[PDB]
């Protein structure tokens, strides 16, 4: 494809009932991502306590809605960084279930 | 059926 986030949006499922508005995908193994809820605790940008932030920083992609984007049309703007990673963790094992920011 | 975990992983892991 010659754009990262439509292909990959569409793929994963983030278009089907709507476009997803924005969304980050983390390019580091699952291992690296899951020990992110061992490190630094931070606080969710809804005010719970349950986010931490990695202390590393780690290879992403960001995309983005355009304007023109109109659902079912969805159409993103690709925007790649290496970023420290903030993600809220629940559950027994603890691991990530929502990606909250990057910083 | 897909889990909190599952679903975390399909939208934001790409390794």
Partial sequence: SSNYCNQMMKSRNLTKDRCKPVNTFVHESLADVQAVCSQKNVACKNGQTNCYQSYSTMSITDCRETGSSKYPNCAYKTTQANKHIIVACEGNPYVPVHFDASV | ?15
């Fill in chain 2, 1 to 15: 059926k897909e889990t909190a975990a599952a679903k975390f992983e399909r939208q934001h892991m790409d390794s």
